Amino acid sequence: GGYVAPKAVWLPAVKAKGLEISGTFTHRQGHIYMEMNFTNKALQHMTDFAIQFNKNSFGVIPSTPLAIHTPLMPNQSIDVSLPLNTLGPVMKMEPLNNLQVAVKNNIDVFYFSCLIPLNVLFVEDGKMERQVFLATWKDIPNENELQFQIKECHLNADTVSSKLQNNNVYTIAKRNVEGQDMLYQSLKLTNGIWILAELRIQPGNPNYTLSLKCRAPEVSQYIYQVYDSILKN
Ligand SMILES: [Cl-]
Ligand SMILES: [Mg+2]
């Protein structure tokens, strides 16, 4: 299984007439979930739960109604797994991975936003053939290449590769070049956009250089972020 961030408070009870939501996102065998905990810190029973998202960069929507079937009584706390997909309307948000959410119950409708970690959008079929990798890297404009630093990393190339693989980031080739390990990696988003990467591991340097090439370079910063998280967790 890939990296899953710990649940964070998305909607505090005091801003939502007692409704408290905490959440995170996961990806389970090709399926994306918004995993939440709803707690009723009010003095009335809560019913009639419903959820919707604003249009967003990767076209993320719930794929079913929110599965809360019984009144959530005062002091009660339930875990809710909401399946998502990427078939919904697309509107480019800033930041690119922001998701606006509305949750309703019988008391009111409440709004909050949260940030989607892009690794849940990394698809299973994201392993480029070596031949295709080289050709695609070359095809993408050199100006699209962006460099980032994975600070303070001490994992071996092998471990880097295995962890990334667990998050559908595939190592296509490894080059040993005078002690340095150069890992060439591919991944593919739910929207079809490929991201190619060169990770440079040097002896004595506690920082790895991650070089990313993408036809949509605005995405790169976000791949870096979760790449960093996967290596640090
Ligand atoms: Cl719903
Ligand atoms: Mg996989």
Side-chain angles (χ1 to χ4, degrees), residues 50-51 65-66:
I51 194 171
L66 182 61

Side-chain angles (χ1 to χ4, degrees), residues 49-52 62 64-67 82:
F49 277 104
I51 194 171
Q52 75 174 308
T64 68
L66 182 61
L82 179 69

Side-chain angles (χ1 to χ4, degrees), residues 27 123 165-168 170:
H27 171 117
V123 307
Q165 188 274 169
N166 278 334
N167 286 274
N168 296 335
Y170 303 92

Side-chain angles (χ1 to χ4, degrees), residues 8 26 193:
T26 73
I193 287 185

Side-chain angles (χ1 to χ4, degrees), residues 197-215:
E198 179 193 67
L199 182 73
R200 173 192 300 279
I201 292 166
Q202 310 187 321
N205 185 338
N207 299 343
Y208 300 167
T209 297
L210 177 69
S211 290
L212 299 176
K213 273 184 94 164
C214 179
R215 297 179 189 288

